[PDB]
Amino acid sequence: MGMKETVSNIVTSQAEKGGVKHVYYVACGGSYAAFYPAKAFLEKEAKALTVGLYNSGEFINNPPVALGENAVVVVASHKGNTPETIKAAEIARQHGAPVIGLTWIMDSPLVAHCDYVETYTFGDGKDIAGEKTMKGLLSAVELLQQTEGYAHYDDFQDGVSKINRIVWRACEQVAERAQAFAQEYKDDKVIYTVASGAGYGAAYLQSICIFMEMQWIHSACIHSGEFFHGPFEITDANTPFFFQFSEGNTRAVDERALNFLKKYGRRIEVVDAAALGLSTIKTTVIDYFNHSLFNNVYPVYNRALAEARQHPLTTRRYMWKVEY
């Protein structure tokens, strides 16, 4: 790891200042959700490190008081020119926090405001062990490991060594179902997403990818636990559900939600990490690999849906500059 080395440098420099006590992940768009696994990892595993996950806009208007020499700030920007994210790195450096930047473009303006820069694999055919989300997690595993010890580091590196094969085989495996999925939902206008736990970020991104295909109403990305309380999303609209079924410690919540939806006869596309072979990653760390699986399989489904859908030229279609 580049990350192992980076964190080792940071842990050395800040020792005299009282150590790393706080980690802040800061990004917008698809870079924000990509750090959700790092946030979930530190919340689950840490005893003496705090973690905060911020949109760049909220961070620079309302930075925490702990921002200082005992904080590390990890910023991400695919192209390295998001103005709010650059200001975050700058505000961090002016408070004496070391900044790690994550970017595809090493020339970018962002780089000039980072103490350390890490890049990632990108595009069709990429190695998943080196992708943006995995680098964000590796920052968290190395900060924990090098400050207080991480009981399951070797299981984790075992996981990193398996995820790429798992994902490539999963994408092949969903191909026929994706086609059928496309025919079944090509005439819907709105679809809900459901998820829980450390892969939720991937579901949130998928909810926005569906929105970008369907372009009608941006629907709620429902946490699985929330069906059992108060209102639930079953009405005369007959909206279908795109259901992220996780491996790991929140699988029991997901199963309870899936059974609920089944008792109401809903239309549900289930995408099950267990059915896609995640289960060879050990129980200790499998929660943290859900995101990399789903986020790299959903494009197969999204491509099929797009291709199954053609629009009259009388229908206005929208495009955006989306932040990877």
State how far Cα 141 lies from the chain centre.
16
Q: Which stretch binds a copy of itself (CB under 8 A): 154-162, 223-231, 269-277, 304-312?
A: 223-231
Give the span between the Cα atoms of 49 and 47, in whole angstroms: 6
Q: Which residues contact 227 (CB under 8 A, 6 or more apart)?
A: 233, 256, 257, 260, 261
Q: CA quadruple 80, 104, 244, 175: dihedral positive or negative? A: positive
Centre a 10 Å sphere on the Cβ of residue 74 and count the other Cβ atoms it contains: 28
Q: Is 109 annotated as a binding residue?
A: no
Q: Pick between residue 167 and residue 278 the one whose CB is nearest to a copy of itself.
A: 278
211 is a site residue for a copy of itself (CB under 8 A): yes
Residue of the chain from 123, 230, 265, 312 that contacts Mg ion (CB under 5 A):
230
66 is a site residue for a copy of itself (CB under 8 A): yes
Smallest distance, Å, CB 10 to a copy of itself? 19
Q: Is 226 annotated as a binding residue?
A: yes
Q: Which stretch binds Mg ion (CB under 5 A): 224-232, 260-268, 282-290, 309-317?
A: 224-232
196 is a site residue for a copy of itself (CB under 8 A): yes
Give the span between the Cα atoms of 227 and 38, in whole angstroms: 26
28 is a site residue for a copy of itself (CB under 8 A): yes
From the list 157, 152, 171, 151, the residue with the least C-alpha distance to 129 is 157
277 is a site residue for a copy of itself (CB under 8 A): no
Q: Are 71 and 92 in contact (CB under 8 A)?
A: yes
Task: Take residue 20 and report the two structure tokens written for it.
Answer: 């790393």
265 is a site residue for Mg ion (CB under 5 A): no
Binds 121, which of Mg ion, a copy of itself, none (CB < 5 to 8 A, cut-off by type)?
none
Q: Which stretch binds a copy of itself (CB under 8 A): 49-57, 113-121, 154-162, 275-283?
A: 49-57
85 phi/psi in degrees, rounded to 5: -70, -35
Residue of the chain from 11, 100, 221, 276 that contacts a copy of itself (CB under 8 A):
221
Q: For tokens 């995995």, what's the residue?
A: 134
Give the span between the Cα atoms of 278 and 293, in whole angstroms: 8
226 is a site residue for Mg ion (CB under 5 A): yes
188 is a site residue for a copy of itself (CB under 8 A): no
Give the span between the Cα atoms of 36 and 292, in whole angstroms: 11
> Which amino acid, one-letter code, is at 106?
M
Q: Exposure pattern of 132-144 as b/e (b: 16+ CB <10 Å)?
A: bbbbbbbbbbbbb
Residue of the chain from 168, 211, 232, 260 that contacts Mg ion (CB under 5 A):
232
Q: Is 240 annotated as a binding residue?
A: no
Q: Are 24 and 71 in contact (CB under 8 A)?
A: yes
Residue of the chain from 169, 220, 283, 307 that contacts a copy of itself (CB under 8 A):
220
Count, residues near a copy of itself per rule CB under 8 A:
66
| Binding site as annotated, residues for Mg(2+) | 226, 229, 231
Would you tell me which residues interact with a copy of itself (CB under 8 A)?
Answer: 21, 28-30, 43-48, 50-52, 55-58, 61-62, 64-66, 82, 84, 190, 192, 196-197, 207-208, 211-212, 215-226, 228-237, 239, 249-250, 252-253, 287, 316, 318, 320-323
